[PDB]
Amino acid sequence: MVKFLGAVPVLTAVDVPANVSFWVDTLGFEKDFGDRDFAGVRRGDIRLHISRTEHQIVADNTSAWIEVTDPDALHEEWARAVSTDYADTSGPAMTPVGESPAGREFAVRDPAGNCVHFTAGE
Amino acid sequence: MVKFLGAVPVLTAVDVPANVSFWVDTLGFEKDFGDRDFAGVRRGDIRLHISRTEHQIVADNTSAWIEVTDPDALHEEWARAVSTDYADTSGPAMTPVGESPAGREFAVRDPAGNCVHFTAGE
């Protein structure tokens, strides 16, 4: 009987080392492995891969959902280091906490253009 | 503290209903919700979201890793339902199971173009 244990979303980026540096140095993830074509980061029980793409439009349409125990606490931690004005596409930024079919969540747009949602989970 | 519980990859598809039917009716996932724009499927402890996109090139560059207990048994189970001629782009298909940098695994390309890897876990 095959058990499905975990899922690893794949974010995409034109510049993998630069996007890895944001997840690690700014959001606090840890680097698992990686080079210029493909890297792995992790935090807690989850992992994210970052794969190189030659087309920017692929990354501006890439997204993922991450479940966390407390989106509001995580939002305030990251609010001191990430712009809270999401409409400014001059750089990475974060939305305010809001509500969705799954409950409280917020999103982060990384420098590569990926949109990752941080949603309440149990 | 803030705990990270699980991650949900987002597959993309120009035709969401069709790609959801592949995952649910061919590969045995369960459908949690979905319309023409967004859907979620699940199996065991993991979930996948499927988001509509207007550019085929996004789907053809979207990928995900799923960790499973035994890829070889899972490949057998789908071997009747899915073509093993990976090269045949006429439709979905999968690779043989073999070693890879992520570990022993195989991959499936779904009707929308996403490439999902099924890797032995722990």
Q: What is the CATH number of the domain that holds B108?
A: 3.10.180.10
- Say whether B4 and A45 touch across the interface (CB within 8 A): yes
Sequence-distant (≥ 6) Cβ neighbours of residue A106 within 8 angstroms:
A71, A74, A75, A94, A95, A96, A97, A98, A117, A118
Q: CB–CB of B68/B74 below 8 Å?
A: yes
Which of B44, B53, B61 has the CB atom closest to A53's CB atom? B61
Q: Would you state the structure tokens that stand for residue A100, as one six-digit string?
A: 């969705």
- Say whether A4 and B43 touch across the interface (CB within 8 A): yes
Of A19, A15, A34, residue with least CA distance to A108: A19
Sole residue written with tokens 């099924």: B118
- What technique determined this structure? X-ray
- Say whether A2 and B45 touch across the interface (CB within 8 A): no
Q: Is the dihedral of CA A83, B55, B12, B71 positive or negative?
A: negative
- Say whether A67 and B121 touch across the interface (CB within 8 A): no
Q: Using CA atoms of B113, B92, B21, B62 in order, give the dihedral in degrees to the nearest 10.
A: -20
Q: Whole-angstrom Cα distance, residue B58 to residue B40?
A: 18
Q: CB–CB of A91/B28 below 8 Å?
A: no
Q: Whole-angstrom Cα distance, residue B94 to residue B84?
A: 5
Q: Whole-angstrom Cα distance, residue B118 to residue B1?
A: 31
Residue A51's φ and ψ, nearest 5 degrees, are: -110, 140
Sequence-distant (≥ 6) Cβ neighbours of residue B33 within 8 angstroms:
A101, B39, B40
- Say whether A10 and B77 touch across the interface (CB within 8 A): no
Q: Whole-angstrom Cα distance, residue B37 to residue A10?
A: 20
What is the domain extent for residue A118?
1-122
Q: Would you state the structure tokens that stand for residue B35, as one six-digit string?
A: 């319309």
- Say whether A45 and B8 touch across the interface (CB within 8 A): no
Q: Would you state the structure tokens that stand for residue A90, as one six-digit string?
A: 């001059």
Q: CB–CB of A45/B45 below 8 Å?
A: no
Q: How far is B89 from chain A (nearest CA, A)?
A: 20
Q: Which of A35, A50, A61, A68 to mutate to test the interface with B (most CBs of B within 10 A)?
A: A61
A120 conformational bin, left if phi > 0, alpha if psi -120 to 50, beta if neither: beta
Q: Would you state the structure tokens that stand for residue B18, as one six-digit string?
A: 């069709």
Number of domains, chain A: 1
Q: How far is B8 from chain A (nearest CA, A)?
A: 5
Q: How far is A85 from chain B (nearest CA, A)?
A: 23
- Residue B112's SS3 state is coil
